[PDB]
Design an enzyme around this catalytic site. Sequence first.
Site, PDB file in Angstrom:
ATOM      1  N   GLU A  11       1.190  -1.277   0.018  1.00  0.00           N
ATOM      2  CA  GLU A  11       0.279   0.226  -0.332  1.00  0.00           C
ATOM      3  C   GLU A  11       1.010   1.383  -0.404  1.00  0.00           C
ATOM      4  OE1 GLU A  11      -3.041  -0.237  -0.313  1.00  0.00           O
ATOM      5  OE2 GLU A  11      -3.789  -1.803   0.367  1.00  0.00           O
ATOM      6  N   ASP A  20      -6.652   6.129  -4.743  1.00  0.00           N
ATOM      7  CA  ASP A  20      -6.076   5.082  -4.909  1.00  0.00           C
ATOM      8  C   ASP A  20      -5.715   4.443  -6.372  1.00  0.00           C
ATOM      9  OD1 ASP A  20      -8.727   4.500  -5.607  1.00  0.00           O
ATOM     10  OD2 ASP A  20      -8.532   2.914  -3.744  1.00  0.00           O
TER      11      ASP A  20
END
EC number: 3.2.1.17
Length: 162
Positions: A11, A20
């Site tokens: 991440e 994202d």
Amino acid sequence: MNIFEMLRIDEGLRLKIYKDTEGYYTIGIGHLLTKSPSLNAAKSELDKAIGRNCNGVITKDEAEKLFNQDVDAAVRGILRNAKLKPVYDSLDAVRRCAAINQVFQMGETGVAGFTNSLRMLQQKRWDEAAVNLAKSRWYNQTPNRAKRVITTFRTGTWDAYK
Ligand SMILES: Nc1cc(F)cc(F)c1
Ligand SMILES: [Cl-]
Ligand SMILES: [Cl-]
């Protein structure tokens, strides 16, 4: 290697609101803030989560705090799911980290449609499960990450994380 290091590798870490891979507002260590396209909704959500007016930026500690609570919530979501729990409890430790990852990324929801794969993993048909898992939007949208998790489930070792 542990779950935190693993997800931290998948991440990354960002202290400023970002979009994202799906274009949704997120911050820190993959912490999703909202699916809405309004920045203002996102910053409000961030303030609520942190407990202060952040103005879209947080500290590393703050990021790490969110991460701990999110890892926690993920596992708990697993144990509370009747379809999930039994699969998860049949797995060894490393592969259990791979299940958490997938859930952290896609939610309990995303992962419940992996029924056929779930069954293979439960039966410990590693190579078979690994081929089945690749046949998904998840692997086509984020192949490099998905490859790492898949190898993790296929082998039961941390080799893909080096
Ligand atoms: N892939 C997977 C995901 C979970 F949430 C639990 C499990 F056992 C396997
Ligand atoms: Cl919070
Ligand atoms: Cl990827």
